[PDB]
Amino acid sequence: ETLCGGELVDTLQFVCGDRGFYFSRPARRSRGIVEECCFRSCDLALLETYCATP
Amino acid sequence: LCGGELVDTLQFVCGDRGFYFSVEECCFRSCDLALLETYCAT
Amino acid sequence: LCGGELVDTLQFVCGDRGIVEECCFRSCDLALLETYCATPA
Amino acid sequence: YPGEVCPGMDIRNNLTRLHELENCSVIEGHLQILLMFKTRPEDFRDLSFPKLIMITDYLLLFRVYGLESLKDLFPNLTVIRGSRLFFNYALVIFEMVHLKELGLYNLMNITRGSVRIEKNNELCYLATIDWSRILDSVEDNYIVLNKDDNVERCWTHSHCQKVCPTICKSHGCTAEGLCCHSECLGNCSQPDDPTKCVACRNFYLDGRCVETCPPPYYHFQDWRCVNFSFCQDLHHKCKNSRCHQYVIHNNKCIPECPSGYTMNSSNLLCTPCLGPCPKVCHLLEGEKTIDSVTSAQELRGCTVINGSLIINIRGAAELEANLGLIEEISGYLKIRRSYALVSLSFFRKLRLIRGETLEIGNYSFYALDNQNLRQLWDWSKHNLTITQGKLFFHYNPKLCLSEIHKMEEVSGTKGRQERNDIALKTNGDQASCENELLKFSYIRTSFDKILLRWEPYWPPDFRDLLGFMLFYKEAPYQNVTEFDGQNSWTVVDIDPPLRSNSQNHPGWLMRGLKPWTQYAIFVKTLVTFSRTYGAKSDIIYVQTDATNPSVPLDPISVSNSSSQIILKWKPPSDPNGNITHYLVFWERQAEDSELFELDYCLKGLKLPSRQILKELEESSFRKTFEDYLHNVVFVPRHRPFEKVVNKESLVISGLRHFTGYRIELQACNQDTPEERCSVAAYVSARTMPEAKADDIVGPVTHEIFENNVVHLMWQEPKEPNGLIVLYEVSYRRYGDEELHLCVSRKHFALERGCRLRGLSPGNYSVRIRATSLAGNGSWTEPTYFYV
Amino acid sequence: HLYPGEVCPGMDIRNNLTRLHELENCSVIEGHLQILLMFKTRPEDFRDLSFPKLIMITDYLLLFRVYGLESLKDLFPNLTVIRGSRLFFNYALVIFEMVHLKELGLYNLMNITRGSVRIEKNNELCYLATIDWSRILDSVEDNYIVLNKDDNEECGDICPGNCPATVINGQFVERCWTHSHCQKVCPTICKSHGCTAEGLCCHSECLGNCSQPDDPTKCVACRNFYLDGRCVETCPPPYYHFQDWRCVNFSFCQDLHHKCKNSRRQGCHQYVIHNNKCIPECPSGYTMNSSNLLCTPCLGPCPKVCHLLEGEKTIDSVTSAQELRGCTVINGSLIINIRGGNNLAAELEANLGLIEEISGYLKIRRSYALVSLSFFRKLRLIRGETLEIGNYSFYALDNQNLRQLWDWSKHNLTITQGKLFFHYNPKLCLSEIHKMEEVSGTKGRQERNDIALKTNGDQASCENELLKFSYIRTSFDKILLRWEPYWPPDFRDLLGFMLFYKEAPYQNVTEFSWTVVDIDPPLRQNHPGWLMRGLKPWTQYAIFVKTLVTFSDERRTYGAKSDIIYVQTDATNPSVPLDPISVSNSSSQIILKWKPPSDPNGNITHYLVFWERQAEDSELFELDYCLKGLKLPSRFRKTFEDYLHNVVFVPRHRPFEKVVNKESLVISGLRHFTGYRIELQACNQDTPEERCSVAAYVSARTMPEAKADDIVGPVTHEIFENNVVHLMWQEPKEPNGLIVLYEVSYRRYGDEELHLCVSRKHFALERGCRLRGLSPGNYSVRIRATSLAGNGSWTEPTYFYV
Questions:
Q1: Of D623, D631, D637, which has the smallest distance from its Cβ to A28's Cβ?
Q2: Which residue range forms the structural domain that includes residue E423?
Q3: What is the disulfide pattern of this chain (chain B)?
Q4: Do D404 and D427 contact (CB within 8 A), yes or no?
Q5: Residues linked to residue E786 through DSSP beta bridges, in sequence order
């Protein structure tokens, strides 16, 4: 199952939920979210890695 | 095309389900079976 | 155009000098019209 | 006959070539003389053709200057048979100058056709020519714009028309007027002599006129008899010439075998032709190119092509009509740079192509630079074979490779092709065949409307989809092609369904249509390329159910008898289903009661009797902004009636004479479950009146008073033509005139007939006639009484 | 006023409002402010928050899915100007997927220096059509506002308006932000200087708003520069500019440069000085000096290399290109991909253009709004070391509007390695591609199907050669044309001429409806030529021809075309006159109304009209007008000649007047109550062999008179011995048309009155009338004449005794 924008945020804050999303500093690198979840299907670990605390 | 002459279409689309009045969106706007589906109440 | 009215065309394009089956039934293209001029008339 | 064959030929621009006719006797053809402008009469008094006798096809004269009498040039011209009629005519003379008289005293008869004379300001002696004696038909002539219009029969001032007696209708009259032979026509050297006939009425044979052609001689041009040898020689002469290829059928040397007949190599007979069996068309260069409708006009009726065809249409149904009768091509087929070719459907009946002559590169089918080409054929059913050769497919932007793959799988040329024979990246660049099926969930129909709902579909990125497109049209029969002309197929756009994350089906309901029809519907997706993920469904055929039919058409009722009324009508404009029957109601129309209170005896005695890239770009722009935002943001760690069946007319009996009747007519296309009957059509019809109804029946009873007062009591015809408005009384006394009186309905009712007072002494009479709606009836018997 | 508060560099808030309190004491933001990803919030949590101190934002403001927010008017009550130094995808203010947001509430924002506003996918936002962006932005068309509550639904923007209103397209509408505030509009004289409440103009340097009119010291934001509260257009030394919005002393720039150098932050820049500006790094041709931070011009041509991550970068927006600003040599590849619909050339050539060399390849894909590659102003070399896949260097794909590729009259170029590639450029001519093929020097490095022969310029006009119309003739409806022949080097290349024509009422007709005719090529004098058909007379038509040639890949045959030629067909007989109606307003006058012909066929010179008097029916003089029904009315072969010429030819006075410019006619001097025939025609040419149309016919009867029906003359009687009275009376010899009968009403003295009929034949044949069987006694006879119009006047009673 490949999920794309619009619904992707709704998928977020549910798998992630509760805590926020990690954001330190810009410091695009061309592999952010859409070519990782919309272009190709992504598992739960990739979505989890965008959480803040865990 | 709206209220009065569209009642046949409303009873057509949902069959025996009934509806509640309001049509201002079909003789100035158009009917597209989406509003006709949601207008009929189960 | 057709018989009678194609006469205006052939006085038009010929100047000072088959039919009807080619312009009534078929298209009228000036390709046959010009070469139908009767020079030794 | 001393002379030459003399094939038909024309003389123009001078009179020199006319001398070529000096050594001729019988013309086997038509003569056409026109455009003599530099001509003078004195140059034509030394020219004559006494040897010329017989003209086969027809004769045309136009714009002749100088000629005044044709008796010199054509002295002995006998008969114009009109074997080849110039549009039902055999002689056309138009726009003559200086031509004053006909001169042709030697024209007796024309076998078929008529004459056309027009715009001859000088021609005269037209009132002394008998066309009935000459031509068997005189109703087709058209002789106007001549000098005569602007009895003895004579051609010229010195030559008569040789007026034959009524017996010699076609035999002909000699110098003494005696009838000639039956085969003799118009004139004869000796009366009743077939050998001495100047002309042959039916057929000619070695100086003798005969009615028919005995075998082995066949009827040649319906004018002579020619054997098989000469006819076959003429056919061979045409065989190695440019043509009228002579064939023999029904003992006739006809220029072509008629419908359903085939030329046989062994014998000149026209055998029955196998099936449609039209023809075979050749190609010396084997490369005739089709540029437009005109170039394909000569291809009408061609089936077998003995060469190669190269289509180049720089442009619809026109080529559909011209083509579609072709089956096999001996050479190769090429289609090159045809802009207005949507599909090769028109090229229907093909099943094999030999390709003996090969396109350079050893190719049998060569398609190149075809832009709008979208389909080749309906390969699911259509069969095509290739005997040998290779295929070429380059620069065909709208033919995806599926059709190319079906090419060799149907033609059996799997191994016949080589690498690069079919281009990969140049064909079907705009064609988006993605062979993703769509299934319709359920469909329901009503007499006015029909509902459509199909299964949902989503590309991998649900934002790519940009609505559906529903195509529909009317399908006459069960088959239809999805590729019509470069039109039709009315379309409606569908908003994409909302992502339900249950599952909603897209669905669509039409708006208005024709009941009881066959509708072809199919749905096509509309997505934006990034790959292509389109989708389409098979052509679904739906049948809208029936309803109340239309009203009957043209209700006409006639009266044929005093009790019989005939009724005729037409089927309704909209049958809306197979019409089961008709319902006819007749109701006796009550007569106008007003006549019962109008005294018509006074004044008023008269009595009536009876464009797209922008939306895709907007969608892509929205999507590419969404992706940019997501990339930047996230970060990892009742009445009498009748049931008429299958009939359009009826006869109704049991009706009183001159009685009005209202007819209510209905059409019912259903019989048992509550017949759906249309609203009726009404018509008022009345029978004719009875002849004896208005006649008074009953002797007149008269009562004489002391003061010569007479009371008249006459029994009215209780069954009149409807009713009696008044009675007319014609009473006459001896020695007096027939005085007249009118007794109204009220006068008859209250006076019990009539009450006349103050009668002069003498013998009176009493004659009374009833006036019904039909008119006056019969006067009563004269009651003679002396007062 | 001054700026009381910190500068609070750019920042974003996520996942809780507790961080938002970092906006406590700052009035200007030196960067971008983002508030996004708010889920566990409700409107009661937002009512408390308010930031009156904040005035101006440097880069942009982005709101993305913040729940529980319904109006920013409480959040941002003093936002005035968005600087837009560094945009966010060529947007300065973004409102994306805002739920519960009912109204913007930014009633105080006035000017956005650079950028655009994009608000979409809200489903709850209205009060949008009641705002005026033209007075807020500079380029309105760059906006993009769709998919809200305003468009699909019908959120009624009820607001005071009291409040100023203005026109947008063709009608006036109020310009209000919320239900309680409206856009502040002031006279255009203060175009951007600002304007106080009463309308007095602010200071010239001022921007947006001010407290004291015409005073820089009392302003809230100024366009040029800021310094020490009282801001000036350009501060003098020792103050150096900074971030285009404020200038600072050298000590500040020096200490921040030291703070960046000692603290090795990955993002900090070694700020230097150049033209009294503390910019992060001066461009090529300068070297930073260790002694003084100002960078001195170097003694050598060392370009400023712009190293590219992963050897590739995609350009899709203004903020994507701005990363390359100031760079002149790229150590990577460039991929132009602008999915747009609005022009982006200006910002591109502002940010790009200083580029000279591309180490990698260049690829322009899917760009829609691109019109020319001219924004690469100073591009000279494409090394192509990082050659693109397929061994291509210059790549182009599906550019729907790429028209001009470069100005080859003056621009140089050089491609070291790789081969070109072009496909699906409908507005690009092959002439430009071949001109690159010559200039770049890659002539020998091209192969098959690397340049599409048909896709490039599918519908364009780049024949670059001209044709001359040798001879043109005009007529009734036929237009004969002949032009000089055109021959390519190989005559087989020519596939045919093709002509276009269209009616041209005006001069302004564009190049390249538009009826098309195909022409077969001529055989190799004999000018190709073609004749016209179905031309409406007296109409101007634009006509021009074109040439169709083969692919011509190896050669350079581009065909030719002639310029637009306007020719007007000659004139002719006009149509029938329209609306012919006739009314009699009097017994002698008649009025005629008509309309100009539907087909004027030329300038209508005049109208002609004939009037005549009809004749009464003869049967009206011998009809019985007192029998029943006496109601007097009141007022094939066609081709037989065709193939005949085929064989012959063989292959080798009523009154009238000239009515000028008037559609109403009045005619006098006519017999009263008489039928009249009117026939009118139109003539569009009078002096040279006057030409007139067909006749439009009508009939009209004049109004009846009164005394005409009435009997004139006394009544005479002659009585015989048998008491038979012959009556003589002169008839009205001038009646309304004619008199059909006379009624004679004769009565006895004290008895009834009887009516006698005297028809025309009764009066003529009998010479008057005769009454028979009249007993002696006084009488009274009146005579009435019944004319066509009606009845006359009864004569005086005839008193006599018989």
A1: D631
A2: 305-445
A3: 2-27, 14-40, 26-31
A4: yes
A5: E741, E791
